[PDB]
Design a protein around this ligand. Structure first.
Ligand SMILES: OC[C@H]1O[C@](O)(CO)[C@@H](O)[C@@H]1O
Ligand SMILES: OC[C@H]1O[C@](O)(CO)[C@@H](O)[C@@H]1O
Ligand code: NA
Ligand code: NA
Lengths: 308, 308
């Protein structure tokens, strides 16, 4: 009867998304907060640690995460900096669809004292916005080092948003430094190419071979996901969906993947990994059926019915 | 056939205002931008100078102001800082209803080179957000000094929003320094008390007697406006309105007042001033009939029909 805690950390944000005509839906969001909810909706055991602003948006994000049964014991309210606020342009997708209105937001002031005690077998999942500026960058690296030290596991997803970085020249090396630390890494096909200075996927994975990463997942959008384990790769694909809102789809993917690994006897098992990537594909498809990153994050009942 | 230019300067902002249920209307706003439109709707000759962000909100504000026939020749796009973004809480009114999401926003980086050439007889109108931080504070003071030097006139409205100031201990003296420079000053009854460390209005005006201000207008909400000229005061009141949205009502007041003084043979004439405060009251009432600071700013046809 296995179920380990999965810690999520980084930016919780309010997503302003076009609706009425000149109206905005006010949607809960922020990539690591999206994953935290995703895991919880699947009956996972997720917990968030980090900083939001001491403002209504921050409180809306707090209440949102606890409403969703995500542990917020270690979610702090920064006394001066504002909660992240992003405007979405639906004509674009992924990184190119976001406009960040608060730089630096409260999360970029994550301090060492905000890290909770890690235990053996627990998971930690991280995105690159957490590495964008100080003190969050160095705080986040310290937390990764502490999780590995204790016998836990590290999940990383670049999830790139360049305009957040005050020194964008530092993105490549900083992101690749975290890749070098994780047990599990997930790229989009574009991010992998971009980050390894390569064209094609095969050359991408080449550039990181020396890292001995236990599991690299490269999502192919239409064609599913490529699953790279030591000395083997294969494509795992499921059903497709004409998407209504692609926002946070990649996070739902990460949600399913981490829910399944977190309840596994042994996450390194290949049958286990393949199954996990099958849940991850279903989640990512379903998540696109309603506006808002979190709105359509599936419970197990929905997911199984979609996969069958 | 008189009509002088009225320069407005400071913050242009996008006001997020509750609507649907968890929707936000996206409304043009920002106090000095509200006054600029107000003057133009009355067929005035208004012009805005200052900085917005090089982002969609900034461009939305630019297009808004030129659509409204306000001269934006001297409206600059800051290369790094974001456009001001404010969340409105309709349960409160005035200052207490605003949450500022961008601090410091692009306008707080107003530089000396952004000031346009002033001419004799022109007007300049200023709010305290323009004095909140540097370099805008010192830039704004320099522009006031330059307008007086050339033979033009200065309008000031505290229009207080405390959370914008990085050093809020500096608000009182900085605001009062600008009061000491203006030909025309308008307070709310609350701001006057607050700013002169007094209770009642009579004691308030006492504290500023030494300034020899040509015209002080104190708006009484329900009871109209108190008009203080050298050695005389009187209340000017008009019809009342159950307000739907009080947002920017004070700015519409300032709009009418400055439109009328700007087209006058001699703004110092008492009949002229009294008439101006009558237009100002009508504007402030009408402005509250629709959500959004700028939405219900009246044209002359509307205003006269309301006043008759
Ligand atoms: O992946 C989706 C999430 O990524 C962000 O752009 C930054 O965290 C959020 O605004 C959005 O919800
Ligand atoms: O007076 C109304 C205006 O004042 C502000 O709070 C700050 O400039 C704006 O958000 C609003 O439109
Ligand atoms: Na979605
Ligand atoms: Na209004």
């Amino acid at each position: 009867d296995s179920m380990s805690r999965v810690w999520l950390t980084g930016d919780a944000v309010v997503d302003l998304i076009p609706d009425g005509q000149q109206h905005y839906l006010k949607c809960p969001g922020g990539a690591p907060a999206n994953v935290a909810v995703a895991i919880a909706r699947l009956s996972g055991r997720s917990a968030f640690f980090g900083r939001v602003g001491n403002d209504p948006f921050g409180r809306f994000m707090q209440q949102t995460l606890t409403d969703e049964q995500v542990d917020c014991q270690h979610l702090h309210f920064d006394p001066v900096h504002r909660t992240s606020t992003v405007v979405v342009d639906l004509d674009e997708h992924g990184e190119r669809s976001f406009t960040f209105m608060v730089k630096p937001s409260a999360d970029q002031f994550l301090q060492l004292s905000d890290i909770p005690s890690f235990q053996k077998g627990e998971w930690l999942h991280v995105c690159s916005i957490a590495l964008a500026n100080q003190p969050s960058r160095s705080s986040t690296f310290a937390a990764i080092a502490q999780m590995k030290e204790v016998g836990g596991y590290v999940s990383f997803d670049p999830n790139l948003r360049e305009e957040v970085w005050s020194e964008p020249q530092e993105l490549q090396a900083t992101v690749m430094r975290a890749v070098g630390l994780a047990d599990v890494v997930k790229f989009s096909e574009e991010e992998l190419q971009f980050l390894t200075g390569t064209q094609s996927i095969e050359e991408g994975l080449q550039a990181i071979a020396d890292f001995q990463i236990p599991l690299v997942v490269v999502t192919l959008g239409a064609k599913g996901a490529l699953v790279a384990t030591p000395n083997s790769q294969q494509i795992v694909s499921g059903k497709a969906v004409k998407p209504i809102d692609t926002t946070g789809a990649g996070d739902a993917f990460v949600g399913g993947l981490l829910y399944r690994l977190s309840v596994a006897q042994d996450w390194h098992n290949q049958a286990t990994i393949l199954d996990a990537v099958k849940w991850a594909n279903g989640c990512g498809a379903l998540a696109t059926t309603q506006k808002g990153a979190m709105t359509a994050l599936p419970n197990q009942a929905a997911l199984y019915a979609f996969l069958e």
